Each structure stands twice: as C-alpha cells, then as structure tokens.
Design a binder for this molecule. Sequence first.
Ligand code: FMN
Lengths: 145, 386
Amino acid sequence: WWRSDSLWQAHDARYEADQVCVIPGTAAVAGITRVDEPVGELLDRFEQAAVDEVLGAGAXXXXXXXXXXXXXXXXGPLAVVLDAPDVLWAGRMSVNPVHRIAAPXXXXXXXXXXXXXXXXXXXXXXXXXXXXXXXXXXXXXXXXX
Amino acid sequence: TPTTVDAKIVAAAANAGHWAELAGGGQVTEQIFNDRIAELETLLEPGRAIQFNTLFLDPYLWKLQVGGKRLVQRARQSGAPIDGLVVSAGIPDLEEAVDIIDELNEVGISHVVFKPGTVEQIRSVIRIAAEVPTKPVIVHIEGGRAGGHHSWEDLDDLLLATYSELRSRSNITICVGGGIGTPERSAEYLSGRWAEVHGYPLMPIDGILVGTAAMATLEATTSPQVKQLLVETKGTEAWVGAGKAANGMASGRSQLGADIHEIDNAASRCGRLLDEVAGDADAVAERRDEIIAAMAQTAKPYFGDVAEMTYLQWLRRYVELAIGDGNSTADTKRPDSPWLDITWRDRFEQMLKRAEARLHPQDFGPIETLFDADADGERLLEDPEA
Ligand SMILES: Cc1cc2nc3c(=O)[nH]c(=O)nc-3n(C[C@H](O)[C@H](O)[C@H](O)COP(=O)(O)O)c2cc1C
C-alpha cells in the first residue's frame, strides 16, 4: 500500500514535496546543481566540452573542427546513399533499397568513382543513383522501358 | 518512468538533436501509449527519430508487451518514426531476444538495447550478440550507484572483467552509465584512461547515458519544488555501504523487495519510516500509535475511526484527496490531461451509489435511475460538493 505507484507525485503536484519518493542516483547528484536548465543546454554542455578537451590536446584545432564552422563534410552524397539504412518518404520511414540493390544486383555499376559530381551507381534491377541540384540526390529506378 | 513518460520532454530532448528512450512504465495499454507516440510524432519535426523502453519485471506487462510489441510492430509496419527498443530490469532469453530482433518492425528497430546488471547478465547479452552478428546491439552497462532500479554490483569490476569478451563482438556497442553529470568526469571513460587507475590498459567506450542530471531540466515535467529539492542535494564519491542517508541519498526496497534509490534528504519522512515499518513488522500492533501517526506525516492518511466516522466524512474525504482545488478537476478535464483521475471519480461514484444502496427502505426506483444517466450524472460529478 505504501510503495505502490509512488513515482508520479514528482511531476505537476502542488503538495509538499518532502512527502514524495523522488528518484536520483547517489554520485550523479553532485553533478546536479543548475535548476530548470534546458535539456538542450545540458546535453550540448556534455558534447561541447568533450569536443574542446579532444580538440586541444590531440587534434589541436583539427581540420574536422575547422571544416565544421566553414561547412565541410564527411560522407558526401555518394556515401550517404550507401550509409543510412532508412529512406524517408513523406513522414514514413523505409529501409534503404540500395542494401537490396547493391549485392543482389546481377550487374552493378559505379560510374566515375573518384569524381563526386558525376558519381553514378546503377544496377541490373534497373535502379540508378546520381546527384542533381547540389544537395538533392536522385535515385532512378525503371521497369522495362 | 516519471521523467521520460511525458511526450513533451522526450520530443524536446530529441529536437535538441539527441537520442532518448520513451518510458513504458507510465503507459498501461496499447491505446494510451499510442497517444504518446502520436503526440511524439506530432512534436517530432521532420525526420527526427526516438526509441522506446520496456520492463521485464512482471508477467502482466510482458503479456501487455505481446500487445505492446505488436503495437510497435504495427506502428513500424505503418512506418512509425520510433527507431529503437529498450529492454530493462532484465535480459531476455535467446529465443525471446531473437523474436524482438526479427520482428516485422526489425529494420525500424535498427538496433536492440539491453541493460545487464551482473557479470552473468553481461555474458548473456554476448550470447544474444553472437546470435545475430549483423544486428547492432547497444549494451548499456549500468551500476547500482545509478538511480531507480538498483543492484549490488560495482561500476568498475564488472566492466573491468567482461570488457575483453565484449569487444570480440563487433555488433556490440558498449555504453557506460550511472553517476555522470558532466563531460569532464565522463571524458576518461571515453579516452579509456579510466582503466589506468586499476592498472588495466586503456578501455575506451562507445557511448554514455545520463539518467539523473537531466531531471532538473527545464522541459522536464518535474515540479518546481521537486527540482529545487534534487538541486540542494549534495552528491558523493564512490557509494558507501553504511546504512544512512548518504549525501541526500538512501536506498530503499520496493514492494517486490528490490532496492530503489530515492531522495532521503529532500524527503526524509517516507524512506526512513518505511525502513522502520519494514524492520518492525511483527509487533506493529504495539507501535500502532507511532506507526499510524507517521503515515499521516508522510500524507498516507488512514481514515478517522471507521465506525464512528459519518458517511459525509467518508465521501468528503475522497473528494478532499482526489479533487485538487488548485488544478480544479472540472478544469482539469477540459484540456484532456493524462493526469486525469477519472477512475477516482468513478471510485467515488461506486461509494456514493453504495450510500443510496445502504439507506433506502423502498424500491430504489427514484434515486438509481437518476444518477446513472450520462448527461445528468456527469454534470453531478463535476460538482463534487453539490
Ligand atoms: C526517475 C528514474 C526512472 C528510471 N526508470 C528506469 C526504467 O524504467 N528502466 C530502466 O532500465 N532504467 C530506469 N532508470 C535508470 C536510468 O535508465 C539509467 O540507467 C540511470 O538513471 C543512469 O544512472 P544515473 O542517472 O545515476 O547517472 C530510471 C532512473 C531514474 C532516475
């Protein structure tokens, strides 16, 4: 009777909060000081200071950090097609057809590998991928003609 | 459970560009939980994706999960944004884990999440990893220094011993968690420098989870007074065995006997009394005066003397406890808040209808046929005093 459903009073309750079971951890509490600090701030605070510590010693103003403020990338259009397993259509998530296009294809062709802009990946399933209008990646599949 | 159950915070955390797990301990049905995902996907901006957390503890939830997993299956068969599943409090057996991994929603699962608490539990997941070597498995290694569900197992020694075998599987993503509020203290586990204190060569980690430090956050539904309470609590170094409130933190056992880390400074009355009552139950009748008054101190009120108490006092006590004046249950019903107590309002009705059932000498024609009408009865309900 005492312990049942004791976790909900910590949220949206006007009652004295010294009567309530509220759940922290022991050692993590020390790291808890700032109150009503947005989630985005705390999680970034972790990432941003982890970056700085990694940057300063080993990286020392790395090309990766400089490329970011200047907008340069890893995994360009050709890689992105072969990387992300999820293919979005509207608000729905689908599996990457290239996963089933790449290997199962009888004849698979990667056109102009080292050159990014002209890069093309085609298959005997009749599915071909190329880039158009910069960031837009164009996948072209065909049935018969 | 309390924190991430709100669709608002898990969305806001994801909209900040971060991975998060929607709590399942606050959702008792497929339908009620499907509302949350719908509220999530609405607050989810384009493309953004979240995961789900489930508990192994009791059979009813595991039977509910059969409907729950098929709900997750149906959702992702419909193409739902939720990209992961988290099994908690225990590690499913191989045949149980294979099912989860191989579900119709599998691609939408994209990885499976397990939380080993013991050396044996770790070795169990390794066997789940070798089961499907091509399926990503994120192994979150927690402590008992963590919050909520507890354990007697050290943070280091477990990971210290089992790390080598964990790295023989490429599909295993090692994630250390517990007792971490900051990037600075958690940086050494990432570099692998943390194992050097124990003499073991560098032992890097792939990821880090923060449970506790995110509770005082702005978008969290934690009450203003409760947040201030979590704050003023002083923290500690490596957990100590001696029974006490330790840095505003003392362990306590749930109804099933498993320990729970709760705040014993912010609230000192519930936890310590519970330990008193627990260790004291043979002679409870003798300490009854001491025990029954302490329930009233923590606001777990018994009723005034049961016989002598007037039916009003009965019916007025339920209204007192169930109906908040500040939140205005009538005004609480209009937004359609999930905090709605409606079973409590239905509880009070069955008591009211019992009162008419108890005192009426006649055929019960006039009274019962009135209060039972929808339009009539619901209007009578929103006005408890009347
Ligand atoms: C209020 C609260 C509720 C929690 N609920 C669950 C849960 O339902 N399932 C679970 O596996 N872990 C749960 N946890 C544990 C966290 O998922 C995480 O493992 C732990 O909090 C990390 O340790 P730390 O917060 O002390 O750093 C909960 C923790 C807290 C504080």
